[PDB]
Design a binder for this molecule. Structure first.
Ligand SMILES: *[C@@H]1O[C@H](CO)[C@@H](O[C@@H]2O[C@H](CO)[C@@H](O[C@@H]3O[C@H](CO)[C@@H](O)[C@H](O)[C@@H]3O)[C@H](O)[C@H]2NC(C)=O)[C@H](O)[C@H]1NC(C)=O
Ligand SMILES: Nc1ncnc2c1ncn2[C@@H]1O[C@H](COP(=O)(O)OP(=O)(O)OP(=O)(O)O)[C@@H](O)[C@H]1O
Ligand SMILES: [Ca+2]
Ligand SMILES: [Ca+2]
Ligand SMILES: [Mg+2]
Lengths: 32, 260, 372
């Protein structure tokens, strides 16, 4: 129910630029 | 102390899932206080796990292990596996030959040698190393010759002269011709004594090849070898196998030696 | 500058990194292994346990445990090992100096949310933490606050209606079928045509074929007809050893399971039908907005064609004239994480963290009021 929730929801609507990040993805199958 | 080196053709999940063949592999391993298994094609270590499951199903400390990552110049890869009885010896340290720099071990070897330092209380040698090598058949002369450099590396890192170099060296037939022995420092230097001779047949196949070897350096270690104990172990004769069954186990015999 | 952490715990994969970033720094298996035997890797010292990518690749000499089943945490000692590996090894950071956002499955039991909080504060000693519902975060990532998420991962698939930022518990649907079942079913149908996949590597290969060659037919029965009368849908796939196998209708029969769970003996409604049933359990007013805002997230929505198929399926179900829109963003494998990174780096959020100070006073059950 918190204070400043609407402003939060408004900011989620506006969207946000996020920063370039190289993922260390270790989910790929190991194929032999 | 019974020590052995054994190229088990494509040792992997399929092979160890086969109760019969597992059976024979276990019996064979059980002969030894230390055994080097080569040609481990076991991407997630499942086959290594099964074998150990069998070796330890009674006493959980019958055998301990040293295992390498998958190794190979290209996309075809193998592991080295050391199995050893902790009651008979102890592993003090281990490393992978790297030639001083990350990918630099691949400069001499397709499968950069694993090196194990053991402690042994029941033998004249109290400490020795074992260097494992399964050479690339087409570069066998250079790789066996490069082993001389591995020995220098060991000497420098562990200040230790007692070193056993062993495994499927591919050291014979069309891959090492007799005239090429004069160019392998490992053979021409008096520091090394060659226990499996050129005359030995170490293949389970039609060929007559001393492919698998055991070389020892250091007076102490040398003087600990039981005279005449080094031989290939023909498991087809030993277990009364048809040849078909022998070949389904491996196309090599273990080569073994005994220290005292 | 004090940066917040974002950690999305899943049945198959942990996704972890820093708020403010466009993607996780780390994705690894949600797994913990203890060695079944005594020994070392060459060059290494002896280890009591492995986590993540290392556990997966050494599984054969280990005993594995998956602390997260169907999205819910069931094993705490092991979850603890995973979060530790996450901070210290993967993200290389000290927990005691980062706020941390954690995610939970929908319908997560309260006691669960509390134990999560308690560990964060009393074990890892974080300065502040928060817990958000996954479906909701991936809604957020798509820039919206009302709508309906279809989240399909490795063990579990949910439909989560969201209104003004709040999930609607009463209308949530859970379907117990996801990536793993899909992998198994491909393995089953590849075998049915004579191929063999029994090694660990060989099972891993099936997953690879799934992730690279599978798709959803816009019309399953027409696709069956085409494959029955032309090679136009055949696809070569090359194994490690370099020999080649062909994959025909298995490419789209595999994922069709999502729409027809009977393909694997289940009696469920398919994801199109559960999506529609969920919207229809909702307030009459909010339904237009749910239909126009159907967001898809999770690894199991990565199938080429899936959005189009959903589009068509929903239109056939819904009122003749309802505006329908499926949002299937290309980064959707990691939408949950991404929405977490947005939420936790927003200015207007910096007041909503639960602090160490608040937890000390109120206790673990403060996580209900403060994580509205
Ligand atoms: C485990 O490994 C062994 C060794 O390869 C396998 O045994 C071999 O494979 C089959 C056994 O069914 C044999 O081939 C057969 O030959 C007989 C000849 O009488 C024939 O009747 C069959 O139609 C078939 O072609 C082979 O001879 C046999 N033994 C060898 C090669 O020494 C075994 O099958 C493997 N798998 C297990 C036991 O699960
Ligand atoms: N391109 C792709 N196509 C189809 N499936 C994929 C693709 N990439 C990943 N997957 C599947 O997604 C699953 C993992 O998805 P995800 O990481 O979204 O779920 P999770 O968070 O681990 O588990 P859950 O959400 O069920 O608790 C795996 O089964 C994987 O094979
Ligand atoms: Ca022979
Ligand atoms: Ca998930
Ligand atoms: Mg000879």
């Amino acid at each position: 129910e918190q204070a400043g929730r609407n402003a939060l929801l408004s900011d989620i609507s506006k969207g946000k630029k996020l920063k370039k990040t190289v993922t260390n993805d270790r989910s790929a199958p190991i194929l032999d | 102390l019974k020590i052995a080196a054994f190229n088990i053709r494509t040792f992997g999940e399929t092979k160890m899932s086969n109760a019969t063949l597992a059976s024979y592999i276990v019996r064979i391993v059980r002969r030894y206080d230390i055994v080097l298994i080569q040609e481990v094609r076991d991407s997630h270590l499942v086959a290594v796990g099964k074998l150990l499951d069998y070796l330890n199903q009674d006493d959980p400390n019958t055998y301990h292990y040293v295992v390498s990552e998958p190794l190979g110049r290209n996309s075809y890869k193998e592991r080295y596996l050391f199995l050893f009885r902790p009651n008979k010896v102890s592993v003090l340290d281990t490393y992978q030959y790297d030639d001083g720099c990350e990918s630099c071990g691949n400069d001499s070897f397709s499968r950069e040698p694993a090196v194990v330092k053991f402690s042994s209380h029941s033998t004249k040698v109290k400490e020795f190393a074992i260097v494992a090598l399964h050479s690339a058949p087409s570069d066998a002369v250079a790789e066996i010759n490069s082993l001389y450099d591995v020995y220098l590396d060991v000497q420098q890192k562990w200040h230790l002269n007692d070193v056993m170099l062993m495994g499927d060296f591919n050291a014979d037939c069309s891959y090492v011709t007799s005239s090429q022995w004069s160019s392998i420092r490992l053979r021409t230097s008096s520091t090394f004594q060659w226990l499996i001779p050129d005359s030995a047949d170490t293949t389970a196949t039609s060929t007559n090849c001393a492919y698998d070897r055991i070389v020892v350096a250091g007076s102490l270690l040398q003087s600990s070898v039981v005279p005449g104990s080094a031989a290939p172990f023909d498991f087809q004769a030993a277990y009364g196998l048809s040849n078909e069954m022998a070949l389904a186990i491996s196309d090599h015999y273990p080569v073994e030696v005994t220290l005292t | 500058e004090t940066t917040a952490l974002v950690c999305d715990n899943g049945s198959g994969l942990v996704k972890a990194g820093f708020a403010g970033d466009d993607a996780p720094r780390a994705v690894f298996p949600s797994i913990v292994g203890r060695p079944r035997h005594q020994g070392v890797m060459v060059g290494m010292g002896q280890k009591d346990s492995y986590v993540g990518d290392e556990a997966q690749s050494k599984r054969g000499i280990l005993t594995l445990k998956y602390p997260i089943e169907h999205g819910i945490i069931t094993n705490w000692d092991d979850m603890e090992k995973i979060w530790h590996h996450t901070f210290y090894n993967e993200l290389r950071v000290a927990p005691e100096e980062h706020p941390t956002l954690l995610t939970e499955a929908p319908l997560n039991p309260k006691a669960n949310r509390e134990k999560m909080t308690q560990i964060m504060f009393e074990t890892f000693n974080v300065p502040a933490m928060y817990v958000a519902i996954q479906a909701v975060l991936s809604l957020y990532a798509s820039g919206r606050t009302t709508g309906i998420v279809l989240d399909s991962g490795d063990g579990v698939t949910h439909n989560v209606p969201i209104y003004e930022g709040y999930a609607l518990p009463h209308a949530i649907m859970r379907l117990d079928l996801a990536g793993r079942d899909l992998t198994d079913y491909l393995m089953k149908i590849l075998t049915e045509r004579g191929y063999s996949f029994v090694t660990t590597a060989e099972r891993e290969i099936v997953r690879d074929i799934k992730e690279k060659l599978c798709y959803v037919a816009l019309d399953f029965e027409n696709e069956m007809a085409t494959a029955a009368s032309s090679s136009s849908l055949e696809k070569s796939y090359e194994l490690p050893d370099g020999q080649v196998i062909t994959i025909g209708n298995e490419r789209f029969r595999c994922p069709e399971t999502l729409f027809q769970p009977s393909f694997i003996g289940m009696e469920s409604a398919g994801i199109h039908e559960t999506t529609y049933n969920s919207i229809m359990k909702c307030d009459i007013d909010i339904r237009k907005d749910l239909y126009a805002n159907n967001v898809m997230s999770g690894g199991t929505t990565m199938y080429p064609g899936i959005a189009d198929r959903m589009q068509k399926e929903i239109t056939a179900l819904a009122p003749s004239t309802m505006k329908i829109k499926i949002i299937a963003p290309p980064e959707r494998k990691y939408s949950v994480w991404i929405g977490g990174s947005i939420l936790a780096s927003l200015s207007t959020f910096q007041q909503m963290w639960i602090t160490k100070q608040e937890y000390d006073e109120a206790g673990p059950s403060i996580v209900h009021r403060k994580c509205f």
